Design brief:
The complex is a heterodimer.
Chain A: E1 3-8, E2 11-16, H1 24-36, E3 42-46, H2 60-63, E4 67-72
Parallel strand pairs in A: 1-4
Antiparallel strand pairs in A: 1-2, 3-4
Chain B: E1 4-11, H1 17-26, E2 38-47, E3 50-59, H2 69-75, E4 78-84, H3 88-104, E5 112-117, H4 128-138, E6 142-144, H5 153-166
Parallel strand pairs in B: 1-3, 1-4, 4-5, 5-6
Antiparallel strand pairs in B: 2-3
Classes of the chains: A alpha+beta, B alpha/beta.
The complex binds phosphoaminophosphonic acid-guanylate ester (GNP) and magnesium ion.
Phosphoaminophosphonic acid-guanylate ester (GNP) is lined by residues 13-19, 30-31, 33, 35-36, 60-62, 117-118, 120-121, 146-148 of chain B.
PDB class: cell cycle
Keywords: Ras, RBD, cell cycle
Assembly: dimeric
Chain lengths: 77, 167
């Protein structure tokens, strides 16, 4: 199965994806619900591009990456 | 500014590995069954008066991800081997987890606890002395837990840290 690695403040989560047309928004929502519970605002960053939020409406395919950092908006990775 | 302990939760699919982990970390019971690939959670706790960092690895019960076991078994410092008291197949499955951990550790003793989870449920198909005797054959404690009611959840994880500290 395909999955992405999400690095967060207190550990990592592997998030299953059906395909690379999934949006980055869907991945973030799954990561936040698992690691934080029911709902602070969060962003995802490409592993190799720190301090820049990925466009959550874009597809996983458009990111050309399989590892992301989950960061609270007022914080850094 | 404190010691970290790397704990690993293993066992068949659906026994409650994730529910146990999230009850410990977040004081919350997960009702949904979202199968795990792999997730880690770090939390500062006080155990026997000593502050430390727990690094808990929540692993896959689904056989599709069985290749991952080699990696995490080598560096894990203590293992919760979890079955569900209403699922004798998950009790059978404990042996394959214990045997793979043993092989990767070259047959050393490893901090480990046999955990019988879902003890809140009325249906019980694993017998108590049966579970105690499996634990005794491995030389490890047996602890009955419920991720739903939090029964003995801290006991199970904290026993690993007590053992890692002594070994
Ligand atoms: N009644 C009860 N249900 C529990 C308990 N622990 C887990 N469950 C339930 O059992 C189901 C599976 O739990 P989960 O923690 O996802 O199991 P898992 O071992 O992590 N599964 P996987 O190996 O696929 O990741 C969920 O519906 C969960 O609510 C418990 O102690 N009591
Ligand atoms: Mg799980």
């Amino acid at each position: 199965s395909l999955f992405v690695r999400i690095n967060a403040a207190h550990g990592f989560s592997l998030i299953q994806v059906d395909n690379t047309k999934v949006t980055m928004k869907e991945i973030l929502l799954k990561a936040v619900k698992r690691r934080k519970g029911s709902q602070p605002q969060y962003r995802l960053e490409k592993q190799s591009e720190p301090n820049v939020a990925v466009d959550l409406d874009s597809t996983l395919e458009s990111q050309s990456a399989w590892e992301f950092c989950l960061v609270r908006e007022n914080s850094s990775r | 500014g404190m010691t970290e302990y790397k704990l690993v939760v293993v066992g068949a699919g659906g026994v409650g590995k994730s529910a146990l982990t999230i009850q410990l970390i977040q004081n919350h019971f997960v009702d949904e069954y979202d199968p795990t690939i792999e997730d880690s959670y770090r939390k500062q706790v006080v155990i026997d008066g000593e502050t430390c960092l727990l690094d808990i690895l929540d692993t896959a019960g689904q056989e599709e991800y069985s290749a991952m076991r080699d990696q995490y078994m080598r560096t894990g410092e203590g293992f919760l081997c979890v079955f569900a008291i209403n699922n004798t197949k998950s009790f059978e499955d404990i042996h394959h987890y214990r045997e793979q951990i043993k092989r990767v550790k070259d047959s050393e003793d490893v901090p480990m606890v046999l955990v019988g989870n879902k003890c809140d449920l009325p249906s019980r198909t694993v017998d108590t002395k049966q579970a105690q005797d499996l634990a005794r054959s491995y030389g490890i404690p047996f602890i009955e837990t419920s991720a739903k009611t939090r029964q003995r959840v801290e006991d199970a994880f904290y026993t690993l840290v007590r053992e890692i500290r002594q070994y």
